[PDB]
Structure 1
Amino acid sequence: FRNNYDGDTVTFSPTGRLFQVEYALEAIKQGSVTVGLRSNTHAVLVALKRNADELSSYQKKIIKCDEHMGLSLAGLAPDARVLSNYLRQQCNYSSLVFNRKLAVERAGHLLCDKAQKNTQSYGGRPYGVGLLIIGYDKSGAHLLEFQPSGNVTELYGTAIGARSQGAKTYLERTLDTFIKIDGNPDELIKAGVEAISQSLRDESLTVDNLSIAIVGKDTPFTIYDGEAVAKYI
C-alpha cells in the first residue's frame, strides 16, 4: 500500500525510490513556467511571474544570488528560499576563502550532496522544488537543472513548470540556429519570448507577468522587469 512506505523518509520501495520523491517532482509542474536557453557566450532565463489576485502584488520568480548569478524557481516557495540562502552562503565563502565566484557545476555538485542528506534523514524531506540556475563563469555560459532529489544536469536548453515538454519541442527545433549566434544578446532573448507563449494553452502572456534575466560574457546579472520586456516579444 501507499500508506505503508509513506510516513518517514528512510525507506526504499520496490520501485527503486520512495513515493514521496515523485510527489516532490510533481509539485514543480504546479509552479511557474520558466524556460532556460543558452548560445555559448550568454545564457538567458525567461520566467512567468504569477500572483493570486488583482490587488495582490507579484511574487518574485527570479532571486538574484550574486552580481553574476541568479536562479528561477518552480514549485514550492518556502524551500526555494532555504536553498537560495545556502547558495548565497556557499558563494560568499568561495569568494572569502579562494577569491572564487562559484561555478554553476561546482555549486550543482555541493547542492546534490545536501539533497541526499535530506533524503536519508527521516524527519527531513525532499525539497519539492526544481531550479534553473544560470551563470557565466570562466567555464563559459551555463544552464543547469537542479531537482530536489539531487539530480543535476547541464543543458543547452530545458524548461520546468507548466508544460515543460511544451517548450522543449520549440527549443529543440530552433536550437541549431540561435546557439550559433554568438555575440548578439538580443536574438537569443527574442527566441526565449517566442518559445514561452506556445507552452501556454490555458494562460496568456503579458508584460508584467514576464521577466527576463540574462548573464554572459558582457552582460553581468541584469533583470528586465515589467515594462522593459515588451522590446523582446
Structure 2
Amino acid sequence: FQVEYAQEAVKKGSTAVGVRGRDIVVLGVEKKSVAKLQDERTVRKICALDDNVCMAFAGLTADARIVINRARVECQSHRLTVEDPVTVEYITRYIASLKRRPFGISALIVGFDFDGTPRLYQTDPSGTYHAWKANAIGRGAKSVREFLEKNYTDEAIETDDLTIKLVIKALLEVVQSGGKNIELAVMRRDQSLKILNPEEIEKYVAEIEK
C-alpha cells in the first residue's frame, strides 16, 4: 500500500546498472540532462558510503540523500565498535531495515568485504535485499537485466573487457550515444572509488562501436 508508492519513482528514475567481476565491481548510471542554466555538479547519483563500498540509486533524490547520509554513519559507527570495515551485506541490511513508510529508493550497493570478495546487492523499497551477479535498477531495468542475463560467462577474462562490453553496453541498450550521458564508476580490490571522467568514458565507447 505505502511501499507501492515508493516503487513508482524507481520505475521513473534514471537507470542504474551494476555487474560484479572477479577483481573489480562496476556501477553505471544514466546521467540525465539538467537544464540550460543548471550547474550539473549536484545531481550525481553514484555516492560513496565508505572506502570499500559505494552505491547507486534511482527514485526520489530527496529521500536518497537521507539514505546516503544515514548509511555513511553506520559505515563509520561500525568501525568504532568493530574496527573492521563493513561487509557489503551489513550496510545493505542496514539500508533495507532503514527502509513509518520506507524511503523511496532502490540502490545497487557494491564493494568488497575485508576478504577481497566482490559483492553486488539491491535494496528494493519493500525492505528486501539479496545478492546479484549483475543487475539493473531504474526506468528501463527489465530490458537491461534481460540483456545482462544473455552475457555473463566468458567476459571476466580482462577487467577492462568485462566492464565495458557489459556495463556501458547495457546502458547503451537504453541510454543515448553516450559520452555525456553515462556516469560510470569502478573500484578495484582495496584501491579507491574512481568515477571515470568523460574524456575516458568516451574512450571505452569507441572500443564498443568497433
Superposed pair shares fold, TM > 0.5: yes
Q: For residue 193 of structure 2, what is the amino acid of its counterpart?
A: F
Report matched runs for 1:187-198 at 5 Å. Answer: 187-191=161-165, 192-198=167-173
Report what 2:47 is aligned to.
63
Is the CA contact (8 Å cut-off) linking 1:144 and 1:152 kept in structure 2?
A: yes
What TM-score does the superposition give when structure 2 sets the normalisation length?
0.88
Q: CA RMSD in A?
A: 1.7
Report what 1:87 is aligned to.
71
CA distance in 2, matches of 1:96, 1:199: 42
Q: Which runs of 5+ in 1 are unaligned?
A: 1-17, 116-120
Q: For residue 141 of structure 2, what is the amino acid of its counterpart?
A: S
Report matched runs for 1:4-83 at 5 Å. Answer: 18=1, 20-58=2-40, 59-83=43-67
Is the CA contact (8 Å cut-off) linking 1:24 and 1:127 kept in structure 2?
A: yes
What TM-score does the superposition give when structure 1 sets the normalisation length?
0.80
SS in 2 for 1:162: coil
Q: How far apart are 1:139 and its partner, in Å?
A: 5.8
Q: Which has the larger radius of gyration?
A: 1
Which 4+ stretches in 1 moved above 3 angstroms? none
Q: Which runs of 5+ in 2 are unaligned?
A: 206-210
Matched, 1:212 2:194: no
Matched, 1:132 2:108: yes
CA distance in 1, matches of 2:78, 2:57: 23
CA distance in 1, matches of 2:12, 2:199: 26
Is the CA contact (8 Å cut-off) linking 1:35 and 1:46 kept in structure 2?
A: yes
Q: State the percentage of identical aligned residues.
A: 29
Is the CA contact (8 Å cut-off) linking 2:102 and 2:127 kept in structure 1?
A: no
Report what 1:147 is aligned to.
124
Matched, 1:173 2:150: yes
